[PDB]
Amino acid sequence: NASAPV
Amino acid sequence: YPPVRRDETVVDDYFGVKVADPYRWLEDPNSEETKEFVDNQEKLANSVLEECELIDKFKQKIIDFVNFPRCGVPFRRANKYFHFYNSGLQAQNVFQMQDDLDGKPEVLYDPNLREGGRSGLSLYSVSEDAKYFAFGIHSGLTEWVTIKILKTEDRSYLPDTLEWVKFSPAIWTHDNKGFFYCPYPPNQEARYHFLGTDQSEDILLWRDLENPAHHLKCQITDDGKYFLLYILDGCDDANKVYCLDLTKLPNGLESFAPFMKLIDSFDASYTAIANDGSVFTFQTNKDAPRKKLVRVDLNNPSVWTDLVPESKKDLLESAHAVNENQLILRYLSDVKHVLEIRDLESGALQHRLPIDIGSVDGITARRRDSVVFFKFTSILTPGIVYQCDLKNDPTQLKIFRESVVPDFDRSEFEVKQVFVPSKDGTKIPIFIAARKGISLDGSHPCEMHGYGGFGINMMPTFSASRIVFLKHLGGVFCLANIRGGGEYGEEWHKAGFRDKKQNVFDDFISAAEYLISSGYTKARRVAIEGGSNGGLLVAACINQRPDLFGCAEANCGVMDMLRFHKFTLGYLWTGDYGCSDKEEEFKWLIKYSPIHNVRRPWEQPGNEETQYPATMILTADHDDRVVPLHSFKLLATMQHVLCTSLEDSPQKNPIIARIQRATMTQIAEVADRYGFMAKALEAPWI
């Protein structure tokens, strides 16, 4: 549940 | 460089070897001297970072490349579907609920409406009937979590409040009457919480007062009959397996525990995949470092039989029972996934689907689900949720959702896997990503990434910032699968831990030597990065071969290998690292321990022109996992040994700390680290 693949 | 005090009277005797700890006072995060240290370092960092004029151009490109919708892998409970959603730049993903795979979604919990979306959802669990959703909310910055429960039908909360939870999931009994969970006392416990009651009434199932450092995971079989308590020591890939037959309780859980102790030791890892009655199928590393599936009847627990044997080559990473009577086995073959479909009963191969460079994960199907969903990401594939209907079209993987990165042509770039020799001969897989048709003329800036421990497999997943590096800095990216990871099974992990930790650093160094030699780049134009245990990685390599690197970025890494075990949860890292309360082990550690190995390279013969690369030490001021003292002490040491202890030091490259998981917070860190990198490698924007 990472918010964005930054 | 700000002045930093040295306590010259702190010395420890480790088996006759004296070790000074000048910066011992930085181990207290609440002293004002320590806060001042932080403020002074922050003043220096910021001063330097303004000079890095590409930080603002990185920030917008990352932001533009991240701004795309992302549906997560859907899972089913009863006849409802649940998944995570982010429209592109939301701080945290949003849990949504749907009646049908392509019907109207409904927000179920939106963490962005709480503390600015500072933290997102870490624990989340929907009941079998789909009427309840138990999730974990953080209180402040701290590790601790409160469990609350929402009704899905109308999004109203139950009064139920469960405190003192960290990493426990909520595991629902099929009667929908409550769930198992694993809290700590106001010594982790296994407990059962009936819906509608106070936490004080929760049933105790297991505690071990004699082994406080043991911790727990639990599970409930797909038929609902068996509750499985797993017990783990440290970060070993090894666990116990206790089983409780819930159908044999005379008064349900209200009675109360008498576990069948199937595995009562830490020799091997055991994960339950399926069961037919008392006949269980486990995944295990028992006599099989690359893992395998075995079968055992709990009514005759001594007799274990292989069901799918260990592969001579490939790691069996995970396994899932699907479609009543099949297994999907996710293999990692040369750090590339391979999906096999098999018969659950016979273990016979049916279908074998190799996967492109990248990663598949998040397979959440359960035994009664006939449609399987999984997520595929890659360096140049932002994220695809594929679906496989095993009933009606078992062979074709159809695309269910597909993320698109705006204004990015992946056909400009490519990704190859090549294998490189390490000091002791061993071959090391690496992934090299870069623009098509480039000349291997040694000119390109290069970013290498690795981790190197705890059986973690490093997969070439999607990073937007990395595209920006590739496109707008003409960069070459390398992900390095060094030893200590679990990519080639348990022997791969054991060849880079404890007494053999050094091999890990040697593997990374070799990957850099490969990229210098093949014409991808050159010494001093290479940037290394890694977090946590991969911060340790970075720190160790630049101590041993600072000549190879132009830039280095260690994120909340472990730097004092002598004392790491004394702080928060560092004691669970002694399986990988050793512990400096034991001479043999002390001797591994002292050789590579970052803060104790900072030496001036220009004082070595034939090496006068070498300096440490530009170093950014990224860390929080108050981290509960890897205590920041590590990063501070290292920063303190480097700055001393290489800069403030000399009048006019050859160390011109800067040594800073960046001091601070929400999306924009994350883009800021990454844009900073990348701009710093651009300035350090003397690399222009394109």
Ligand SMILES: *C(=O)[C@@H]1CCCN1C(=O)[C@@H]1CCCN1C(=O)OCc1ccccc1
């Ligand atoms: C990052 O590399 C740090 C430093 C070394 C290992 N590590 C971790 O992040 C720890 C150990 C491996 C992953 N990890 C972790 O999440 O464990 C914490 C924990 C697990 C179970 C119960 C209680 C705490």
Ligand SMILES: [Ca+2]
């Ligand atoms: Ca430079």
